[PDB]
Amino acid sequence: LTFCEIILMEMESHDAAWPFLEPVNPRLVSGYRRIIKNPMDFSTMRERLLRGGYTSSEEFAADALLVFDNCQTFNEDDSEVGKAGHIMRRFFESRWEEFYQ
Ligand SMILES: CN(C)CCn1c(=O)oc2ccc(NC(=O)c3ccc(=O)n(C)c3)cc21
C-alpha cells in the first residue's frame, strides 16, 4: 500500500485536484447530500490509508473511483469541477496501471 500512498500524493498535488482535497461541505453545495449518497475525497482516503484501513489495493482504488463517479454524477462534464474529475480519473488510471496491472 506504499504505492497507493505514492499515487495518492501525486493526485493531491495535481493541478486538477482542488475539488477533491477535502470533503464537500453540503451546506455550501445545494443538493449534494441528496444526490451523492457515499461521499469520498482524498483527505478522507489519506486518513484511512495511514491508519491501515485499506486491506488491499482494490479497496483503495474503489474509494478513488468513488471520488470520480460522484463528481461525474453531480457535475456537468463542461463545468470546472466536472472537467477536473475527468482529468483526475484518467491520471489515476494511468498511474495505477504502472504498479497494479
Ligand atoms: C467557481 N468555482 C469553479 C470554484 C469555486 N471554488 C473555489 O474558489 O475554491 C473551491 C474549493 C472547493 C470547491 N468545491 C466545489 O465546488 C465542489 C462542487 C461539487 C463537487 O462535486 N465537488 C467535488 C467540489 C469549489 C471551490
Swiss-Prot record:
Limits of the Bromo domain: 1-99
Subcellular location: Nucleus, Nucleolus
PTM comment: Deacetylation by SIRT1 in late S phase enhances pRNA-binding, allowing de novo DNA methylation and heterochromatin formation. Acetylation is high during S phase and declines to background levels in late S phase when the silent copies of rRNA genes are replicated.
Domain of life of the source: Eukaryota
Tissues with expression: Expressed at moderate levels in most tissues analyzed, including heart, brain, placenta, lung, skeletal muscle, kidney and pancreas.
Its biological purpose: Regulatory subunit of the ATP-dependent NoRC-1 and NoRC-5 ISWI chromatin remodeling complexes, which form ordered nucleosome arrays on chromatin and facilitate access to DNA during DNA-templated processes such as DNA replication, transcription, and repair. Both complexes regulate the spacing of nucleosomes along the chromatin and have the ability to slide mononucleosomes to the center of a DNA template. Directly stimulates the ATPase activity of SMARCA5 in the NoRC-5 ISWI chromatin remodeling complex.
Entry similarity comment: Belongs to the WAL family.
Domain writeup: The bromo domain and the PHD-type zinc finger recognize and bind histone H4 acetylated on 'Lys-16' (H4K16ac). These 2 domains play a central role in the recruitment of chromatin silencing proteins such as DNMT1, DNMT3B and HDAC1. The MBD (methyl-CpG-binding) domain, also named TAM domain, specifically recognizes and binds a conserved stem-loop structure the association within pRNA. Binding to pRNA induces a conformational change of BAZ2A/TIP5 and is essential for targeting the NoRC complex to the nucleolus.
Subunit annotation: Component of the NoRC-1 ISWI chromatin remodeling complex at least composed of SMARCA1 and BAZ2A/TIP5, which regulates the spacing of histone octamers on the DNA template to facilitate access to DNA. Within the NoRC-1 ISWI chromatin remodeling complex interacts with SMARCA1; the interaction is direct. Component of the NoRC-5 ISWI chromatin remodeling complex (also called the NoRC nucleolar-remodeling complex), at least composed of SMARCA5/SNF2H and BAZ2A/TIP5, which regulates the spacing of histone octamers on the DNA template to facilitate access to DNA.
Protein name: Bromodomain adjacent to zinc finger domain protein 2A
Protein source organism: Homo sapiens (Human)
Full-sequence portion shown in this chain: 1799 to 1899 of 1905
